[PDB]
Amino acid sequence: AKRHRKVLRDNIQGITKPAIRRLARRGGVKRISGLIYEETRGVLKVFLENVIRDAVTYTEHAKRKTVTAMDVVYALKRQGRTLYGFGG
Template identity: 45%
Template sequence: MSGRGNGTKGVDQGGSKRRRLILRENIQSISRQSIRRLARRVGVTKTVTIVDVVYTLKRQGRTIYGFGK
């Protein structure tokens, strides 16, 4: 066992690796903030914290100081 996948052989060797690379690139291009925004729109998080308000104001160009990080 060399630890390099599931040991497929034949013509289609490496197809899953390519798919995995494309998926990883797509996932890495999504920022954490956009995931948070989508979750808020879908209704996953129902509590709005001070950090959320500060973040939204910062996105709109109205930075507020004294809160958050």
């Protein structure tokens, strides 16, 4: 059975264990338990869908199919997370 589906579902597993370890090293974490990574993936997925839904709403207001960087900036700004370096 060489044929399969083109779509992929484990794209949350693309945020690998050493990436979460590096993000914890930037946060000053010395020791990490093994159950941290699934919780971190769930938290990142929740945050990403919260930002992406607002960005998509900003995109469909402009009658567009392309999510620009300014829509992401506005979506982050509305929830209280202002991001610099992309608004100019």
